[PDB]
Design a protein around this ligand. Structure first.
Ligand SMILES: CO[C@@H]1O[C@@H]2CO[C@](C)(C(=O)O)O[C@H]2[C@H](O[C@@H]2O[C@H](CO)[C@@H](O)[C@H](O)[C@H]2NC(C)=O)[C@@H]1NC(C)=O
Length: 164
């Protein structure tokens, strides 16, 4: 079985994840913004980027924001809808959590949420986290509410790619 690092290298060659300048360190212990994760989802699932459209009101969510085409693409695909509908806030600088990642991947893979699922996830997410655990995207001992580490995102993305 491939290590996290070998899984990363594969995803990177494929354009789905990136490294950092001037180092081979993949920084598997660090976190990831929701903007970057939207981009991961686009590259992982082969989605079309949507230019010149803005469905959120966050400060600096505009045409100069490199993430908008990715954010719009995952929004149009129904994978993500942001954090509150009435102010139209996506939170692109906020970090992706393991339960949030679970929802997007389970949805994209067309897997079904677990009903009556019992776990430590926020109420809205319990079914998606559990489904994700069952499909081997995250380990059952991951904290649904924590920022997902890049290592966790790599293992999820890799597993997701294998399933798709
Ligand atoms: C703090 O609120 C959450 O923010 C999450 C941010 O990340 C995602 C994956 C996103 O879409 O960007 O999920 C957001 C949460 O959205 C909730 O997603 C559920 C999963 O499908 C939906 O069933 C719920 O309708 C949605 N809202 C609530 C209140 O649970 C939920 N957002 C909202 C608007 O309720």
């Amino acid at each position: 079985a491939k290590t996290t690092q070998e899984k990363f290298d594969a995803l990177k060659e494929a354009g789905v994840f990136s490294g950092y300048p001037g180092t081979t360190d993949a920084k598997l212990g660090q976190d990831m913004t929701r903007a970057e994760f939207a981009k991961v989802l686009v590259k992982l699932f082969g989605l079309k980027e949507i230019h010149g459209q803005y469905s959120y009101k966050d400060k600096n969510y505009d045409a100069k924001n490199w993430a908008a085409p990715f954010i719009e693409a995952v929004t149009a695909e129904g994978l993500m809808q942001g954090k509150d509908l009435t102010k139209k806030i996506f939170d692109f600088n906020g970090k992706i959590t393991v339960e949030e990642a679970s929802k997007t991947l389970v949805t994209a893979l067309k897997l079904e949420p677990v009903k009556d699922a019992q776990n430590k996830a926020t109420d809205w997410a319990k079914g998606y986290f559990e489904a994700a655990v069952n499909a081997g995207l995250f380990s059952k001992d991951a904290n649904p509410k924590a920022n997902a580490t890049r290592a966790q995102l790599v293992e999820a993305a890799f597993a997701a790619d294998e399933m798709s």
